[PDB]
Amino acid sequence: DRPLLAVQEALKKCFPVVEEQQGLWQSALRDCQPLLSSLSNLAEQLQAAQNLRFEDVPALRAFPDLKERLRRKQLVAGDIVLDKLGERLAILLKVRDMVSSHVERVFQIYEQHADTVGIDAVLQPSAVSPSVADMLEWLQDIERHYRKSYLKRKYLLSSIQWGDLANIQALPKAWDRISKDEHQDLVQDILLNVSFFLEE
Amino acid sequence: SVSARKIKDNAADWHNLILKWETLNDAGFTTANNIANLKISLLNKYNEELEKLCEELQATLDGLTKIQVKMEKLSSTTKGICELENYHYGEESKRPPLFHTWPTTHFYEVSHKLLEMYRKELLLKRTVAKELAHTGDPDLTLSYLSMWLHQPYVESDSRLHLESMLLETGHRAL
Amino acid sequence: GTLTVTNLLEKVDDKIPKTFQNSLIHLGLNTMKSANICIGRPVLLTSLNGKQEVYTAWPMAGFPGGKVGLSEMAQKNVGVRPGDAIQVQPLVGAVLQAEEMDVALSDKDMEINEEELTGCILRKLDGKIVLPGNFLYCTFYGRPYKLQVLRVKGADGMILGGAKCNTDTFYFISSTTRVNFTEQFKVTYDMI
């Protein structure tokens, strides 16, 4: 019964990798929220600066180069916040690449030994264990969920430009909309289903 | 051991004065944001608490004026000790430095440009405290609060310059 | 001053910005004590290939003597390996601001608009003494960027296209420097 034990010990290796990378993903998104609130405040201040004229307001004619210095300090604070968001995106890309490489390792070792172990052995559940087909389907769903979430957040962070400020003020509603739109608890329910197989 | 001890006192008093400027600026920003929220709650819908909030903003500006007076006398005694060394050592003399490398005229230009920057920034804060309680356009209120917070006459690289004296005095470890 | 080139140290402490890490080279104390190099001032570095680059020193300890510590991006900009030699001289000439600087760029980045590129180049590269034949770096919105520097113009009126002496006047990038880029109704009194 060697190839079925090979597939089972590969799945036993594969699941606690996904537990650590889910913890890294959750810590990165929890860091990502208040920097976006900081960008929304700074875009509001920059639109209030660009709205008016400094040539007709009384008691500001003694300062003849105020607007460029104020705009320079607001822009360098915005560049600091964008650099921190880029570091969080690098954490998310490392999580996605390592999870996908371990999933393709599992499918490679299944495709090697697939002819000796029949359809009947894969399609058989038990009182402590789900079937091998359910676990392979669940791992494929985990990989597709991670890739779709990363590419949506990457396009949202690549549409930030200082010429238009309404989309900068509407960034955190779209960032909450990405988390609201997807499937709610996917990784936790799969791990709670397979934990009795893992601790045996 | 006399002039070098004056550099030891001057760099530490510079760093301490920057720290008290930051503490007084945070207190002033909290009082100004409360003043603007009370004004918009007035106009959207008195003189005792508005007068009290303006008076503690005036006490914050008086503390910043005291810090600027100590800054001016510290730059004046640094100018005096550089001119004292220039008069004492003569014109044609290759002076060895008091620390490893730097001459004292570099300390004079560092203190002069720091004094000029903080002197302009204090005048902008006096104009903001003059004009904050009377205006009605909310874009100009957000602009005045941003001028209090972001300090557009204080440049970033002068902090690098302050740390140059912190590697000319030695309070930070090499 | 003629010490061999090694890489930057792995023990990196936090400096004051994130921006000025690129121009901050690393040195030990006996190099400034011996070669008479002041601290806080830019120094000029000449390689064996004829390239001159100017940077800013910072004297932390825990550094091996007889070596100069450069970053790997500065080593790729100069074009030397760890083990090569370099000449270090302090700038004794007077320096001041400039007026014109022109940017050479490839075709694939002509889609970026010129005005916010000029604003981001002036904001990220401030206080940097520029010379022709050098590749500057800036991180436009998280994306890296490279560009080439052509000729400069002076405040006194002298024109640079040579200037290899420490007494020579060099120019640093500030605001109110105009940047060139390389690769109605009218109703006049005539036509009434």
Swiss-Prot record, chain B:
PANTHER family per the UniProt record, alphabetical: CYCLIN-DEPENDENT KINASE 2-INTERACTING PROTEIN (PTHR15827:SF2)
Family statement drawn from the similarity comment of this UniProt entry: Belongs to the CINP family.
Function: Component of the DNA replication complex, which interacts with two kinases, CDK2 and CDC7, thereby providing a functional and physical link between CDK2 and CDC7 during firing of the origins of replication. Regulates ATR-mediated checkpoint signaling in response to DNA damage. Part of the 55LCC heterohexameric ATPase complex which is chromatin-associated and promotes replisome proteostasis to maintain replication fork progression and genome stability. Required for replication fork progression, sister chromatid cohesion, and chromosome stability.
Coiled-coil region: 46-69
Compartments in which it is found: Nucleus
Provenance organism: Homo sapiens
Protein name: Cyclin-dependent kinase 2-interacting protein
BP-aspect Gene Ontology terms: cell division; DNA repair; DNA replication; ribosomal large subunit biogenesis
Keywords per UniProt: Acetylation, Cell cycle, Cell division, Coiled coil, DNA damage, DNA repair, DNA replication, Nucleus, Phosphoprotein, Ribosome biogenesis
Keyword check for Coiled coil: yes
One GO CC annotation: nucleus
Binding-site residues for Na(+), renumbered to this chain: 164
GO MF entries: preribosome binding
Post-translational modification: Phosphorylated by CDC7 but not by CDK2.
Subunit structure: Homodimer. Part of the 55LCC heterohexameric ATPase complex composed at least of AIRIM, AFG2A, AFG2B and CINP. Interacts with AIRIM. Interacts with CDK2 and CDC7. Interacts with the components of the replication complex, MCM2, MCM3, MCM4, MCM5, MCM6, MCM7 and with ORC2-containing complexes. Interacts with ATRIP. Interacts with CEP152. Associates with pre-60S ribosomal particles.
Superkingdom as given in the UniProt entry: Eukaryota
Curated annotation (Swiss-Prot), chain C:
Disulfide bonds: none
Cell location: Cytoplasm; Mitochondrion; Cytoplasm, Cytoskeleton, Spindle
Mutagenesis or variant effect for residue 170 to I: Reduces protein stability
Coiled-coil portions: none
Superkingdom, taxonomy of origin: Eukaryota
Required for interaction with AFG2B and CINP, as annotated region: 1-161
Implicated disorder: Neurodevelopmental disorder with hearing loss, seizures, and brain abnormalities: An autosomal recessive disorder characterized by intellectual disability, intractable epilepsy, microcephaly, abnormal muscle tone, and sensorineural hearing loss.
Function: ATP-dependent chaperone part of the 55LCC heterohexameric ATPase complex which is chromatin-associated and promotes replisome proteostasis to maintain replication fork progression and genome stability. Required for replication fork progression, sister chromatid cohesion, and chromosome stability. The ATPase activity is specifically enhanced by replication fork DNA and is coupled to cysteine protease-dependent cleavage of replisome substrates in response to replication fork damage.
Family: Belongs to the AAA ATPase family. AFG2 subfamily.
Subunit structure comment from the entry: Part of the 55LCC heterohexameric ATPase complex composed at least of AIRIM, AFG2A, AFG2B and CINP. Associates with pre-60S ribosomal particles.
Swiss-Prot/TrEMBL domain comment: The first ATP-binding region binds ATP with low affinity whereas the second ATP-binding region binds ATP with high affinity.
Stated name of the protein: ATPase family gene 2 protein homolog A
Organism name: Homo sapiens (Human)
Residues of the full protein shown: 44 to 355 of 893
